[PDB]
Symmetry: C2
Subunit: 300 residues, 2 copies
């Protein structure tokens, strides 16, 4: 059978999205309790973005210059402050739809759902991974400024990301909900280079286990490998090194399928060295690395 | 840049999902106003599914044999009836979260979002296409019985699909919300054959336009084709025939990119005949056919 890339249900986040407008600049904000969070470059014009002095810019703004709209309801801003690269707008009404929530900072290679919004209204939802170089792949709408990334754990929304910028290379960069960028990026118009983007090895192995569970078995072999010998091949193909901690979290999938982790590593080594020879895995001609081991377990 | 497969925001549907249990059988139901809709084989045991007489089975059931749970709230069933392959359970409480909604029957090749649920609780959301042979691809969880497919138009949820069965080939079949199956399938354990699954040509062309909009241009050529000559090649590669109506709905994308539809058809012909020669489009080594022309316009 197949195995779809699923996002988390977005309902708890939809009720928090708002439109924030300062002059000609409009983007998305997050309304939790009596605070609206949004990227601080809402206070910039296109021509300010080369070398903005955000504190000086923020001083020239008054509360009435921030127009916040929740659906077709205008909120009254009563204060404004800046935490790192996030603007916090104080409003006179607590969001009655505020879910239970946390702010978390995630690690490269972990996954999350994004609710893509256009001028405050939810448009779509997708699942993605933080690349090892701290970028996010997607289109302009996919990364529309102020849209947030999140995971759901039982009853609690864990907010981990907010889109801020599209780099000149067409990939996206953003912050945690405390305003700290992921990666070496800044909210200015500067040619900003990202590091080498590697493939998330442990996620590829998780997906190969998902393939076996769903009946795909042609890539299995009777070969063996050590961890060091695998990592020598991985490095040649721009795959991240596999650690013993990664081996440990694949344990549940190894137990379910009866394939030892290092045996699946021997299968991956052969796929990297020889390709697929015109065959597919789970309907894909490429190895997929946006499923974590935990994602696969939740869905298998 | 990239171009993600986005689902619709699921919040309006999450509030309608419930758990329905008859004895040892549990699945998902849809709670709209004072009616719960679910697959009628909830009243069957595993051993009844070979040749069930659904009317006789339904007669032996009493209202108290249907246990409906909305989250951790048990609903009181006060009536039960059957419309085609859908069971309708009358409850004493209208769902206060009932959205504005319609029931629609969709065409092969059209797309919709699925809210995958496990025993009444939303698990994930994904976007998919109705295959030309009226099956849906996905995993067991992806097609968990009673989960529904939908589109959102402005303020209204258009429900178009409900998962009922997994065919022995690992693909899914289901009904519209009036209980009529898509395709030649029935809710029994019978080896049931699906027709030939073809590629949705107009969707592939829409995705090639999305690729050009996002900077991928290597597959464009200075060749031309007629519609008949293209369709001769399409048929060889199990692509659906392209109609003039399909050409018409690609018009907006042709206008935006400056590439006439038949010129993009000449590009597709070359890709089918020669492959990609180790190159990718929008990060894919295969041609993708789960974006309609309308999907691409909404996101580009």
């Amino acid at each position: 059978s197949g195995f779809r890339k699923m996002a988390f249900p977005s309902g708890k986040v939809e009720g928090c999205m708002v439109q924030v407008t300062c002059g000609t600049t409009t983007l998305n904000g997050l309304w939790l309790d009596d605070v609206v969070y949004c990227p601080r470059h809402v206070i910039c014009t296109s021509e300010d973005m080369l070398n903005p002095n955000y504190e000086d810019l923020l001083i020239r703004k008054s509360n009435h210059n921030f127009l916040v709209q929740a659906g077709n309801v205008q909120l009254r801003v009563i204060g404004h402050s800046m935490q790192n690269c996030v603007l916090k707008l104080k409003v006179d009404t607590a969001n009655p739809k505020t879910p239970k929530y946390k702010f978390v900072r995630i690690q490269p290679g972990q996954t999350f759902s994004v609710l893509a919004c256009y001028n405050g209204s939810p448009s779509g939802v997708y699942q993605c991974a933080m690349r090892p170089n701290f970028t996010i792949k997607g289109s302009f709408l996919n990364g529309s400024c102020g849209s947030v990334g999140f995971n759901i754990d039982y009853d609690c929304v864990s907010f981990c990301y907010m889109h801020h910028m599209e780099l000149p290379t067409g990939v996206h960069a953003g912050t945690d909900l405390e305003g700290n960028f992921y990666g070496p990026f800044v909210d200015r118009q500067t040619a900003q280079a990202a590091g080498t983007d590697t493939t998330i090895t442990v996620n590829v192995l998780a997906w190969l286990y998902a393939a076996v569970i769903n009946g795909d078995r042609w890539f299995l072999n009777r070969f063996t490998t050590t961890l060091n010998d695998f990592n020598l091949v991985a490095m040649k193909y721009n795959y991240e090194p596999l650690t013993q901690d990664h081996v440990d979290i694949l344990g549940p999938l190894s137990a379910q399928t009866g394939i030892a982790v290092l045996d699946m590593c021997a299968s991956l080594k052969e796929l990297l060295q020889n390709g697929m020879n015109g065959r597919t895995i789970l309907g894909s001609a490429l190895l997929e690395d946006e499923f974590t081991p935990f994602d696969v377990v939740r869905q298998c």
